[PDB]
Design a protein around this ligand. Structure first.
Ligand SMILES: [Zn+2]
Ligand SMILES: [Zn+2]
Ligand SMILES: [Zn+2]
Ligand SMILES: [Zn+2]
Lengths: 65, 65
């Protein structure tokens, strides 16, 4: 038995956060009221622009569809 | 960079083939005109009932969505 996972690399896109949100890499607040960071279009990971280069490219999530 | 793949184990279901179709494992014809074998609902692999127990469980396909 195996879960079905979607497995690729992150697809980060600049994102406008509507509530205070923290960087999933470093834990600091994503500062500002607009374009505060990047959100992975596939797995939802939120990062600072500066942290984009610090995270592993590996992007996986369980497909519960 | 990486392709994105859907990765799990096969999900075989009995299948009615509308044209002559061969087992993707052993290469012999899926005999008969109905319920000739099983098709993986995820990757499309076609197998004899008897070959279901012979194939590796690993089921992957590229997500081109
Ligand atoms: Zn991701
Ligand atoms: Zn950060
Ligand atoms: Zn399969
Ligand atoms: Zn076979």
């Amino acid at each position: 038995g195996s879960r079905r996972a979607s497995v690729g690399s992150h697809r980060f896109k600049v994102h406008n956060y509507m509530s205070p949100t923290f960087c999933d890499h470093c834990g600091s607040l994503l500062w500002g009221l607009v374009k505060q960071g990047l959100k992975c279009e596939d797995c939802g990971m939120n990062v600072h622009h500066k942290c984009r280069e610090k995270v592993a490219n590996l992007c996986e999530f369980i497909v519960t569809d």
